[PDB]
């Protein structure tokens, strides 16, 4: 019932041989946290693109991929967005604060 603040940040990632180097959970019908439909980052691979860049963190909400908004979408819709990317990907995330 108290206010919850987030910091909104854009992160540009360049894929490596193993892709972006993180995992997502969440989505409408696939809640990562009860009552929350957000897409969440849940894993970051050591040595991967997200790791080396150093901005993305476990616990971050994934708000968008490129021009595709991921607020209140299904896990499948989030995956579809991430699948349809080139070697350069712009993520919009919300970090706890």
């Amino acid at each position: 019932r108290k206010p919850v603040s987030e910091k909104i940040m854009e992160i540009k990632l360049i894929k490596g041989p193993k892709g972006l180097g993180f995992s997502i959970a969440g989505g409408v019908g696939n809640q990562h946290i009860p009552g929350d439909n957000s897409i969440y980052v849940t894993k970051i691979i050591e040595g991967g693109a997200a790791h080396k860049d150093g901005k993305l963190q476990i616990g971050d909400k994934l708000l968008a991929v490129n021009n595709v908004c991921l607020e209140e979408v299904t896990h499948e819709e989030a995956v579809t967005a991430l699948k349809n990317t080139s070697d350069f990907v712009y993520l919009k995330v919300a970090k706890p604060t």
Binding site: F22, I24, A25, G27, N30, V79
Partner: peptide, 6 residues
């Protein structure tokens, strides 16, 4: 339930 690595 569903988790995806990318």
């Amino acid at each position: 339930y569903l988790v995806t690595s990318v």
